[PDB]
Design a protein around this ligand. Structure first.
Ligand SMILES: Nc1ncnc2c1ncn2[C@@H]1O[C@H](COP(=O)(O)OP(=O)(O)OP(=O)(O)O)[C@@H](O)[C@H]1O
Ligand SMILES: Nc1ncnc2c1ncn2[C@@H]1O[C@H](COP(=O)(O)OP(=O)(O)O)[C@@H](O)[C@H]1O
Ligand SMILES: [Mg+2]
Ligand SMILES: [Mg+2]
Lengths: 470, 578, 51, 385, 234, 118
């Protein structure tokens, strides 16, 4: 429609355009030059005399004589529909699968309106992820934000792909029989390379998991503002599907460290003074508007679940990015480098991992009735075994008591069978069966955390029936 | 008031022109959508406002309108049984008109403008009134709500509305100079309400918990802090104090808690019951709720609105307890606001004036004589969450210098499942000596000496923890094993109170005094019986130890009979066994 | 003897060094914030009040 | 432009034992090698240029010494191409921009080098690109940005620094050319943090986009234990994808041997917490054996001499044979411990010298030396006790 | 350096250049840098200090077809004996090695107090070997470094466990390090030739067991091992 | 101090001056200076803190030919056992000694807990 040609200043990622007071703050514009190539931009300051535009991509080839700026939308919006299941997008809504573009039922702003605190309700149901160390000891509840803390060389991508491929709900374990319930996975990646992109596409397409999933994939060489816009579109789609079509969605944000670094770069480009350690002072607020979009709403039948994934810079838990996530999210799962170097996959460490909403999703009428006490007993026995295993290096196995040797063998059997599950898909019943099979190595009477009734019903099954296929 | 237009938008900062006459820190309405903002600058014809909400979509040329007043709250009938955000917006009425999301620019009123209230006057025309006087009474749940002239108003009355049903908007009293008095009045949140005189602490704040009342008491009008690592038990203890204390009105402040925990406290509270009357607990409490995704300016003003409401309920003569959830997140919001203003951080990232704000918040608590002649008190309990575990964290260091009580929690005692997880070697209280004259004149003359004996016995057992670490407790001396078993009995049957348990969550003063008396009598008689030299190993398994544990669960009305039973059992055991 | 030596000598010695390094790094960040403020003020003056 | 990117399935053989065995890099992958000065970033890159199987090698001297570029000009015309038999300089292109040259040309050298490497990719070749220092490029960007009077990043760098490194490293990869052929470009970039501080913004920017990471240690370089790769702080993400090639081309059980070696190194790293506490003489024999085996592995397998006549180049099967010998010795000693034999007499066996000097055996003489040492290992322990 | 380059490359002189203190030059550079409001480096030094030092150091070397040469021996003081200070760091990133003096050796009366472990010479391999000095130079140097490192490591252990718990193997390295610091490094003002230095080095290596010399070929061991240290000193 | 100097040197009084907490004075000084945008010091305190403290502590003493005297006993609370914090450090350079309280003597019940060694 209307074009502005009064460019007066171009330097780096910014350009100034005069007599452009008609533009609204935060609008999206298209920049056209002499060769006809069209780039994108965002208005970051409006005044009476000129407006400031931050440019997507690079500014090679622009000149003050032929450059023109035209408006697209005053608000960044996304067109959503139920036809997006099975599609891929580049982080700004453009399909990259070669399929024809979607038709939108609605167009919604990508910014998130806060949920009314009186409209939320308590999570009560759990999600079966197919991983024993998560399903048994660190249970994931419908409506929880449970981040995963990973190192630099640790396989976070493989764990994310396995969880997205294996996640499901279990209506048959709840109530009188429950009801058929839809399920979908929203996958968002920020700052991935070509290898990760190819691996994710190959993993999602080879087993039919793409038919229930939406992918928002953003490469490392892409513009940084697309990385900022990337998780908000995924959360908009998840909220739309969950609270308008009664879906149960699971949102995985592949890397948040890249998001924080891109946020730092964007803040530094606009002449903002940094905060505590070079990061912006509003980083706590910015992360809060992303995490707190998940939850369950009273009167609505859907739900949103979030599993953020972030990489600690030097396995440092005092770094600001892991520090501020702990004040907003409910627990964490911490990967172990020692278990990774010993050949164990997935290398989930049971000791520093914690889930705070676990006690509300387990019990009678949901999963099995012996879940919590078995988890506590496993935790305590592993905690004893790991210390005895290092006392052995000093005093030897000969100076030990018999029960200390029982614990020493139990720790090795635990690490061999309960954690190192490989690419298997284990239901909750199989994981509980293996957990009880490991506890039968210890003699009855040392199990102080478990009631006598449960021991009289589940103790004593041999590990040999699972020994043939661990 | 002054009206201007926008001439610059850059993030949350908006520069308006034509605003000559606007005052500093006023509240402005920005744009056609009507977003609220605060003025912090003045330069010629222009003023810098800072918008609370999202500014995306605004255009240059939209109007700005000033309200002429700083941040304030509406004080009047209708504040009980309500849920508010950080700037006093009713969350229940917003949900009715909007839905499960909070659309920006919505306009609601703190007090219901269309609810009829019964009005009973107490003044007649021709009277002289001054700020702080009482004129009229209104029924409200189990209370009677008093209508107060604002503290800044003095005049002479000739108008009285007769007894009838009116809304809070209708004038009730009109002064000679034309001043019209309504059932509500506004007050800025950063200016403390005036009082006549401030009194000394001389009456205890009955928490209902044995260890906090006996070992580390806090007086009526004092201040306490309860720090500790995450997963310690702060929230349940604060809720127990809200349930069982003797304070008339309870104010709860959420300074940016997690969404699920805020949902937990929002769901749990309506199911509770008032122990004094048997009705719902929410009829006496006021809730201030914020989440992490609320605007940062609403998070900073959360603790000021609550303390202003608590001071308002103090002026009517009641006793108010103010429980505040973790102030570390409030300090984080203050740090973010300071980073928005480029304030050159001093300590870690915190602004240099953090201690001044913390002192200004904690200094409002006290027992005073109100301007109407009545007596009211305000008690403030706040929580800290130092991330490093050590109490050298700057917020904890600033808090430690202005508090009287310090109830430190420990995570290790939670792992042993001993609740409450109070560290009695790190906690302290400065209110014992002042409460001692009240104790001996009301509870018992021998109460302070008995309490000091209990504390001395607890101190002696802590001195033996080195010898237990080298050699086993069985190889220790008979007297040392005696004092160790006495310390274990004292801990497990006096310092234990389970909050999830139905009848373990409350304890009076007479029960605690009787338990301490029985414990001291048993200890002294067993110490004599050891030197008596008969059945010295079988002393540890006397049937009296059952009676000691039985006093934990005996009813208060049945308590004297069981007290006589236990005392005469001690006599019949130690005097006449051998 | 070894336990007492480790408890009374080594741990506070490491802790003091940690505290000293933390203070030095924080002081350096506080120093560079001032320079960033100065250069922002210089940018504002020359790009808006010259003619 | 290209037609299609491909997944990496072929290793990039560098000729160094630790890099080829423990931290492999694929043909189309990217690697980074940070370290303080005097640790060995340049000798490693020159050895990679000398001995790798890449058809064309492009060397970029961004802001380094002139003697390091004179050495390449003098020595390389005398060496022999490993896979062609001609002069080694006939396959090398040098881009030289020394430290005393003008500052603004440091970025242009990197872009010219990567453009030439991309050009040789389109002809079907496999090109290896060595960047001698990417920190000097960032320093040049900081130097230029001071004249523009912008507001900088954490350490004075321009805010767009991380975008340039990302756009430079994403040019590598195995592609299908527009002519239908197959080509690949691999990039190995060296980073020089100031004062050896790994929290430098350049190092953290590089750490998030590279598939391999070879951290160097100053303490190992002080005691002349080259290549001085810090095993604890190094990782490679190409280990799993290269397993089918190793089974077909080297041996069927090579990944199991590699995993056993890594497990032994992890166990040795775990025990060193106790040795610092109570000394090495407080351990049992089963742990003293692990300590000595870890020391043997570190001194014999990982250590490599780049200026030696024979030790400069090591094929894959030689490393496989050395690993097999070490594991056979460990499995003999672990059983001999259970027969009551003390460790302090096991270490005195003459076969210890036999294993420790298998490095200097020539490539063509190794198949006899390995078979003799394997029989000596068996014969040594059966007559022990 | 202009005079040195002129003399070397126009009249075939062999020039040795000594710079007394580069710390003063860096301070004089920092004064102008701070006066001009330049973007600082790590400790207030200007961001272009690497380039400025590079234009000074890189003027030495030899030229093809000419007989002259330029050799530079700059001297600089690490402020708090700190190797990670910006001036020593940027100097070591440019030059071809360094000689580092040790205060601990100075307090023991040893002169010259050269610490060999942090020292480095990048161009060592060009000037040593067969036909230049002797065939055993490099292996002797490597073995000396490897033995001295073990000696220092055992010194760090005897301060924790006490020397009475040592075996003979650790005691041999401890005695080797103690004799090395007293005889090899400590030389006074005398002018040792290369042959005397190699003789002393081979005498010191004879203290160790013959089978522990892993980095020396067996021909050199069979040719030179067995010299006694008491024939030279005492 | 203005009242004390007047009384002592114009009415021959012997005046003892007690300043209850100088840590609060230093914090208030830091709050004032940081709003005026000047360079900070060792822990964010202003660089002219030594001069400002010296203008307070140096007003005590005795004057020849006059019977009066002024004596100062400031009380300050360290943030820790940190003797190197800027406030007690800069107090030590101006004053003529120090009396240090011991936490170990207070823990075992000794009152007053004055430690003779520092
Ligand atoms: N593999 C090796 N074998 C033998 N000697 C080595 C080896 N690696 C390094 N060295 C020795 O260490 C020295 C390190 O010098 P080099 O030029 O590699 O430094 P650098 O760490 O790359 O530093 P910079 O380029 O920043 O100055 C070499 O000159 C050589 O003497
Ligand atoms: N009096 C008590 N009775 C039972 N459990 C308690 C008691 N006090 C604390 N706890 C336990 O301490 C844990 C911490 O509770 P909460 O206060 O919600 O978290 P935080 O202490 O981190 O604020 C809870 O899981 C609770 O079971
Ligand atoms: Mg809590
Ligand atoms: Mg080099």
């Amino acid at each position: 429609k209307k074009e502005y040609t009064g460019i007066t200043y171009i330097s780096g990622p910014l350009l100034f355009v005069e007599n452009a007071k008609d533009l609204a703050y935060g609008a999206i514009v298209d920049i056209k030059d002499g060769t006809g190539r069209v780039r994108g931009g965002q208005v970051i300051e409006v005044s009476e005399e000129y407006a400031v535009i931050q440019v997507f991509e690079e500014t090679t080839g622009l000149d003050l004589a032929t450059t023109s700026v035209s408006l697209v939308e005053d608000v960044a919006r996304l067109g959503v529909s139920k036809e997006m299941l099975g599609r891929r997008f580049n982080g700004i809504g453009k399909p990259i699968d070669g399929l024809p573009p979607i038709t939108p039922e609605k167009r919604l702003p990508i910014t998130g309106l806060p949920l009314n605190p009186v409209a939320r309700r308590k999570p009560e149901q759990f999600i079966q992820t197919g991983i024993s160390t998560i399903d048994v000891m660190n249970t994931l509840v419908r409506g929880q934000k449970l981040p995963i803390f990973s190192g630099s060389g640790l396989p976070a991508n493989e764990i994310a792909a396995q969880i997205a491929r294996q996640a499901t709900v279990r209506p048959d374990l709840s109530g009188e029989g429950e009801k058929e319930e839809p399920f979908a996975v929203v996958f968002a990646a920020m700052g991935i390379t070509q290898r990760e992109l190819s691996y994710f596409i190959q993993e999602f397409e080879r087993t039919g998991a793409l038919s229930r999933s939406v992918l928002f994939l953003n490469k490392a060489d892409d513009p940084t503002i697309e990385r900022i816009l990337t998780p908000r579109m995924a959360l908009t789609v998840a909220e739309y599907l969950a609270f308008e079509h009664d879906y149960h969605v699971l949102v995985i944000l592949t890397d948040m460290t890249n998001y924080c670094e891109a946020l730092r770069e964007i803040g530094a480009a606009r002449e903002e003074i940094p905060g505590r350690r070079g990061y912006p002072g509003y980083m706590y607020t910015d992360l809060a508007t992303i995490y707190e979009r998940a939850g369950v709403v009273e009167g609505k039948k859907g739900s949103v679940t979030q599993i953020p994934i972030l990489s600690m810079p030097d396995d440092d838990r005092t770094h600001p990015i892991p520090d501020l996530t702990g004040y907003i999210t409910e627990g964490q799962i911490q990967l172990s480098r020692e278990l990774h170097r010993k050949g164990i996959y997935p290398p989930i460490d049971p000791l520093p991992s914690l889930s705070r909403l676990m006690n509300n999703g387990v019990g009678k009428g949901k999963t099995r009735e012996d879940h919590k006490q078995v988890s506590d007993q496993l935790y305590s026995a592993y905690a004893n075994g790991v210390d005895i295993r290092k006392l052995v290096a000093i005093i030897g196995e000969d100076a030990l008591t018999e029960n200390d040797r029982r614990y020493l063998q139990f720790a090795d059997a635990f690490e061999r069978f309960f954690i190192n599950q490989g690419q298997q898909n284990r239901s909750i019943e199989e994981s509980l069966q293996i957990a009880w099979a490991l506890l039968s190595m210890l003699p009855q009477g040392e199990l102080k955390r478990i009631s006598k009734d449960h021991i009289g019903k589940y103790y004593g099954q041999k590990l040999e029936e699972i020994w043939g296929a661990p | 008031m002054i009206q201007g237009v926008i001439q610059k938008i850059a993030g949350p900062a908006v520069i308006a022109k034509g605003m000559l006459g606007a005052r500093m820190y006023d509240i402005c309405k920005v744009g056609e959508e009507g977003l609220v903002g605060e003025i912090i600058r003045l330069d010629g014809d222009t003023a810098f406002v800072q918008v609370y909400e999202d500014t995306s979509g605004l255009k240059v040329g939209e109007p700005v309108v000033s309200t002429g007043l700083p941040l304030a709250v509406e004080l009047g009938p209708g504040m009980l049984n309500g849920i508010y955000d950080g700037i006093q917006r009713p969350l229940e009425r917003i949900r009715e008109k909007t839905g499960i999301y909070i659309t920006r620019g919505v306009v609601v009123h703190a007090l219901d403008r269309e609810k009829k209230w019964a009005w009973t006057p107490m003044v007649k025309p021709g009277d002289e009134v001054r700020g702080g006087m009482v004129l009229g009474t209104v029924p409200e749940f189990g209370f009677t709500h008093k209508i107060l002239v604002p503290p800044d108003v003095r005049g002479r009355v000739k108008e009285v509305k007769p007894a009838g049903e009116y809304t809070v908007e209708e004038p009730v009293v009109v002064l000679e100079d034309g001043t019209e008095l309504k059932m509500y009045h506004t007050w800025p949140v950063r200016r403390a309400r005036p009082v006549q005189r401030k009194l000394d602490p001389n009456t205890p704040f009955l928490t209902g918990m044995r260890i906090l009342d006996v070992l580390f008491p806090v007086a009526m009008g004092g201040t306490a802090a309860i720090p500790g690592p995450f997963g310690s038990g702060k929230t349940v203890t604060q809720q127990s104090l809200a349930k069982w204390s003797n304070a008339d009105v309870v104010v709860y402040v959420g300074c940016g808690e997690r969404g699920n925990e805020m949902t937990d406290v929002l769901v749990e509270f309506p199911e509770l019951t008032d122990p004094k009357t048997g009705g719902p607990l929410m009829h006496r409490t006021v809730l201030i709720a914020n989440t992490s995704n609320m605007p940062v300016a609403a998070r900073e003003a959360s603790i000021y609105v609550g303390v202003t409401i608590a001071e308002y309920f103090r002026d009517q003569g009641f006793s108010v307890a103010l429980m505040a959830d973790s102030t570390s997140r409030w300090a984080e919001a203050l740090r973010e606001i300071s980073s928005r203003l480029e304030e050159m951080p001093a300590e870690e990232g915190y602004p240099p004036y953090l201690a001044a704000r913390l002192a200004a918040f904690y200094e409002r608590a006290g027992k005073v004589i109100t301007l109407g002649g009545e007596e009211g008190a305000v008690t403030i309990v706040g929580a800290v969450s130092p991330p490093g575990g050590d109490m050298s964290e700057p917020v904890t260091q600033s808090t430690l210098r202005i508090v009287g009580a310090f109830w430190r929690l420990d995570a290790s005692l939670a792992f042993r499942r001993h609740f409450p997880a109070i560290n009695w070697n790190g906690s302290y209280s400065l209110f014992t000596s002042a409460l001692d004259p009240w104790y001996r004149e009301n509870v018992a003359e021998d109460y302070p000496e008995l309490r000091d004996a209990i504390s001395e016995l607890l101190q002696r057992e802590a001195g033996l923890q080195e010898i237990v670490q080298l050699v086993g407790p069985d190889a220790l001396q008979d007297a040392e094993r005696l004092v160790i078993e006495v310390g274990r009995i004292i801990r497990e049957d006096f310092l234990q109170q389970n909050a999830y348990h139905e009848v373990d969550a409350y304890c009076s003063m007479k029960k605690a005094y009787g338990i301490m008396k029985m414990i001291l009598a048993f200890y002294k008689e067993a110490e004599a019986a050891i030197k008596r030299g008969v059945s010295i190993d079988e002393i540890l398994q006397l049937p009296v130890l059952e009676r000691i544990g039985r006093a934990r669960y005996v009813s208060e009305e049945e308590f004297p009979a069981y007290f006589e039973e236990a005392m005469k059992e001690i006599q019949g055991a130690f005097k006449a066994l051998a | 003897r070894r336990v007492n030596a480790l408890e009374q000598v080594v741990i506070p010695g490491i802790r003091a060094q940690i505290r000293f390094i933390q203070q030095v790094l924080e002081q350096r960040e506080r120093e560079d914030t001032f320079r960033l403020k100065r250069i922002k003020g210089k940018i504002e003056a020359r790009e808006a009040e010259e003619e």
